[PDB]
Amino acid sequence: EKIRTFAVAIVGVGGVGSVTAEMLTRCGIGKLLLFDYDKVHQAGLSKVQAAEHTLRNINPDVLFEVHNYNITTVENFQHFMDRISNGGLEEGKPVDLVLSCVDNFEARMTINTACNELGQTWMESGVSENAVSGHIQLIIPGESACFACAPPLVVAANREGVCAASLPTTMGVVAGILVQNVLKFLLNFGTVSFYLGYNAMQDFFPTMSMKPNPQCDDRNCRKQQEEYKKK
Amino acid sequence: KIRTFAVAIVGVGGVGSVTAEMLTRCGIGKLLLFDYDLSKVQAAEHTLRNINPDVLFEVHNYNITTVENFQHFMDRISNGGLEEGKPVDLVLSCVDNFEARMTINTACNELGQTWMESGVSENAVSGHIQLIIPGESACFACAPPLVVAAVCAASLPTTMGVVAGILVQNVLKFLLNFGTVSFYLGYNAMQDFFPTMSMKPNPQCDDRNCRKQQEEYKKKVA
Ligand SMILES: Nc1ncnc2c1ncn2[C@@H]1O[C@H](COP(=O)(O)OP(=O)(O)OP(=O)(O)O)[C@@H](O)[C@H]1O
Numbered sequence: 025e026k027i028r029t030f031a032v033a034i035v036g037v038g039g040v041g042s043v044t045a046e047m048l049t050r051c052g053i054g055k056l057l058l059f060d061y062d063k064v065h066q067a068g069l070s071k072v073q074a075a076e077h078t079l080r081n082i083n084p085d086v087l088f089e090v091h092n093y094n095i096t097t098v099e100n101f102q103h104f105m106d107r108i109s110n111g112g113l114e115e116g117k118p119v120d121l122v123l124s125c126v127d128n129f130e131a132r133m134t135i136n137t138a139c140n141e142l143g144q145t146w147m148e149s150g151v152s153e154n155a156v157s158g159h160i161q162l163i164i165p166g167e168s169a170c171f172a173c174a175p176p177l178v179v180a181a182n183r184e185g186v187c188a189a190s191l192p193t194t195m196g197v198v199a200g201i202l203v204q205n206v207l208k209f210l211l212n213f214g215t216v217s218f219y220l221g222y223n224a225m226q227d228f229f230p231t232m233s234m235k236p237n238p239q240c241d242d243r244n245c246r247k248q249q250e251e252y253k254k255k
Numbered sequence: 256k257i258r259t260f261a262v263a264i265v266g267v268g269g270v271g272s273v274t275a276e277m278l279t280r281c282g283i284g285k286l287l288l289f290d291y292d293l294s295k296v297q298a299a300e301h302t303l304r305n306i307n308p309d310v311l312f313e314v315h316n317y318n319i320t321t322v323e324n325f326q327h328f329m330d331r332i333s334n335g336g337l338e339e340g341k342p343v344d345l346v347l348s349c350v351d352n353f354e355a356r357m358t359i360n361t362a363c364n365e366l367g368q369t370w371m372e373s374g375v376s377e378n379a380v381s382g383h384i385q386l387i388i389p390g391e392s393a394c395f396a397c398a399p400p401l402v403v404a405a406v407c408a409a410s411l412p413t414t415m416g417v418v419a420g421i422l423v424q425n426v427l428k429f430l431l432n433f434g435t436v437s438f439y440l441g442y443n444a445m446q447d448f449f450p451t452m453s454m455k456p457n458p459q460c461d462d463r464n465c466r467k468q469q470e471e472y473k474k475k476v477a
């Protein structure tokens with residue numbers, strides 16, 4: 025029942041994002057907001073619209089809102105923040121969680137800038153190009169390290185058939201663990217991980233948590249931090 | 256290279272269906288599917304061939320726990336590989352009951368067949384995969400499961416997905432020979448703990464063939 029009452033924004037509907045959207049659609053999430061800027065049978069149609077069609081056929085009860093814009097532009101970032109602030113299940117209420125499943129540093133940093141301003145909790149996820157590592161990170165602005173608090177973390181791992189076979193499998197594991205964390209966070213059960221790595225070569229799942237950097241480059245991080253230390 | 260291997264999957268529900276699909280998408284040479292009550296395995300074969308028609312399929316619907324059907328099961332593990340008359344490369348147990356798992360154990364000890372066993376609890380909070388190399392590591396009869404600790408309308412399919420994903424990654428590492436294959440890998444969804452270990456065989460194991468295989472393994476080491 026309770027999962028129907030939440031909205032989740034997914035930025036990037038590629039490898040990890042699409043598996044994640046599919047899994048949440050099958051769980052019966054109330055609403056998915058999908059953001060991407062790429063185009064892909066649906067070979068040619070925008071990625072978000074193609075995803076929307078596939079997903080709505082999987083579960084017609086899930087409400088979809090899709091956006092095709094590049095969020096790294098100031099103009100489009102305004103629209104992105106409007107939808108994060110107001111795109112919840114009830115219009116005018118925030119989304120309950122944002123998931124970054126983008127593939128580049130600039131987009132991750134853009135999500136981070138928005139969430140620090142808004143005080144929006146989010147999860148950042150990635151699969152390395154080596155196809156044998158990935159991670160998820162939970163970011164609660166003011167309470168845990170934000171994406172800007174420290175430079176990019178890397179999961180330690182270290183021919184052609186190997187990467188081709190492993191990549192979708194690694195994406196599937198990372199998406200599975202990301203979704204389990206979304207459910208634990210929304211449904212309030214078990215313990216949500218703040219950082220969880222996955223080394224597929226060794227079946228190693230390093231976990232830890234990072235505290236915020238009082239000298240973070242993002243002033244809004246510094247601000248959320250001040251507000252957290254008050255409460 | 257992955258196209259050159261055959262894998263037998265026992266149990267086509269839950270973890271088994273996710274696992275078969277992932278292997279089908281990777282382009283494994285052949286899948287042999289066993290389950291028992293268009294049947295369950297026939298339905299699976301149909302969906303899977305639609306996903307990747309490069310993959311060959313052989314399905315069976317008999318109850319492998321009878322002695323008569325057990326002979327057919329062992330026959331197919333020994334001869335059902337990519338080239339007819341060759342062994343499958345790996346057997347996967349994705350069944351949700353003790354008798355089937357033990358039955359698979361008994362076959363694999365008699366044949367010297369390496370296999371992986373997988374499971375997810377009813378509660379969805381935990382699951383595991385286990386590699387078994389008869390004579391070299393603990394078989395299913397050697398010891399009971401002792402590793403500790405390792406909503407449902409949502410958690411269950413998610414846990415099954417994580418277990419299937421880690422199982423498949425281990426199948427690829429086994430067949431393609433990269434990274435390290437885990438012997439026991441548990442998953443605790445509540446806490447995000449992934450206990451791992453490996454266990455030697457029980458020299459007094461109840462399975463007569465596990466004992467036979469151990470003697471054989473010790474004999475080759477020296
Ligand atoms: N600034 C951005 N705004 C919106 N979407 C973005 C932005 N930057 C990256 N993305 C999207 O994030 C997604 C990440 O997907 P991923 O890298 O896992 O797959 P991929 O390598 O793009 O392969 P495929 O295109 O087959 O999915 C991509 O769809 C990409 O277009």
Ligand SMILES: [Zn+2]
Binds near residue numbers: 240242
């Ligand atoms: Zn910060």
Ligand SMILES: [Zn+2]
Binds near residue numbers: 397398460
């Ligand atoms: Zn034994």
